[PDB]
Design brief:
Belongs to the TRAFAC class myosin-kinesin ATPase superfamily. Myosin family. It comes from Saccharomyces cerevisiae (strain ATCC 204508 / S288c). It contains 16 helices and no strands. It is mainly alpha-helical. It has one domain. The longest helix has about 45 residues.
Length: about 400
């Protein structure tokens, strides 16, 4: 009895109090991320289970012409997903963020699919039709905004977590303990490995990984560089070698995970490590140093060189070199009209990389809802939709 299926479907969708509470509190706030990482063979339906359920429910609302109730249901959904991402923190930050980007991307992708199909096919007034094209068009803009918003909320949280770890790991932690006599580089690699693996396991398009990682490495370069350039009894040949090792490990991680641009992201740190290690004896050494250190200004060069701490049995930086560098800075300043030492960290807002990319092609998928969930009305809707496939 399809009329008995449709009758039960219709009454389940009409009861917004129960259905909305189930969707918002159970499905969305109660989300569980599947285990990701190495040798983990996740199917898409394990990743995007909330989106796929919402897609089944939304479409059944539209099938029954509950167009205004879909609108209020979706308003709650959008609200809830954004709030959920806004509360993300701690060890779950990476997996849970990637999880939500995957799901919002799935939802946006469905809405674009729906809009195209509503515009392209003849199946009922043209005033009902007009308000329906209008609603879906508006839903597309709302999901585009949600995606932009959550990408940005999450990326900022990621930056904050790196602020906290990266400075100790890259700048202060000794790669050679005692050599010049708490987070380490391993924690930084773990962070970036988690981003790589979650994205891989949750089927995130590769352009997104590159955008996230490039934004983050550039941020690391800025904040760590800015801490280093302030240090006055710290910069030495030994610290240069240690920094080279810290930096190089990140640079080689980039190489192996496709990030050809990585070396370019880390240039201020790479070139600082160089400055701290190369000979600084002659005027020629300093002109060579400048070409090597193309990403550093004369004022930056001059701060680093002037704050360099010579070891016992190491030759001082000659005064002639110190004044040569000070007079390159004096010249560059004066060149601003011919005839900051800090790098500004990029805090966004950032372009949503999903927006630059074709949406996912919508193939119909079997009405599935995970067994571990406890959503009575939602599960009944899904079970009923699945019955009318037989």
């Amino acid at each position: 009895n399809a009329t008995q299926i449709n009758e039960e479907l219709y009454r389940l969708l009409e009861d917004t109090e129960i259905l909305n509470q189930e969707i918002t509190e159970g499905l969305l706030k109660g989300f569980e991320v599947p285990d990701a990482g190495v040798a983990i063979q996740l199917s898409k339906r394990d990743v995007v289970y909330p989106a796929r359920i919402l897609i089944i429910v939304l479409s059944e609302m539209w099938r029954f012409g509950l167009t205004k109730q879909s609108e209020s249901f979706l308003a709650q959904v959008l609200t809830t997903i954004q709030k959920v991402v806004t509360q993300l923190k701690g060890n779950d930050l990476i997996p849970s963020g990637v999880f939500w980007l995957a799901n919002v991307r799935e939802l946006y992708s469905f809405v674009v699919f729906a809009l195209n199909s509503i515009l392209t096919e003849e199946t009922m007034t043209d005033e009902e039709y007009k308000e329906y094209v209008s609603l879906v068009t508006e839903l597309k803009d709302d999901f585009e905004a949600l995606s932009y918003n959550i990408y940005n909320i999450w990326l900022k949280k990621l930056q904050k977590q790196l602020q906290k770890k990266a400075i100790n790991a890259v700048v202060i932690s000794e790669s050679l303990p005692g050599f010049s006599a708490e987070y380490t580089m391993d924690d930084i690699l773990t962070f970036f490995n988690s981003i790589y693996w979650c994205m891989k396991s949750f089927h995130i398009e590769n352009e997104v990984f590159h955008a996230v990682v490039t934004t983050l490495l550039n941020y690391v370069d800025a904040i760590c560089f800015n801490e280093l350039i302030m240090k006055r009894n710290f910069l030495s040949w030994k610290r240069g070698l240690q920094l080279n090792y810290n930096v190089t490990r990140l640079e080689e991680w980039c190489k192996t995970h496709g990030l050809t641009d990585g070396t370019e992201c880390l240039q201020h740190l790479i070139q600082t490590a160089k400055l701290l290690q190369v000979r600084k004896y002659t005027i020629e050494d300093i002109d060579i140093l400048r070409g090597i250190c193309y990403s550093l200004t004369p004022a930056q060069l001059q701060k680093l060189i002037s704050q360099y701490q010579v070891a016992d049995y190491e030759s001082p930086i000659p005064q002639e070199i110190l004044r040569y560098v000070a007079d390159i800075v004096k010249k560059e300043a004066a060149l601003s009209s011919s005839g900051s030492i800090f790098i500004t960290p990029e805090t966004g807002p950032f372009t949503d990389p999903f927006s630059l990319i074709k949406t996912r092609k919508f193939d119909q998928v079997e009405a599935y809802i995970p067994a571990w969930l406890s959503l009575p009305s939602t599960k009944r809707i899904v079970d009923l939709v699945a019955q009318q496939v037989v």
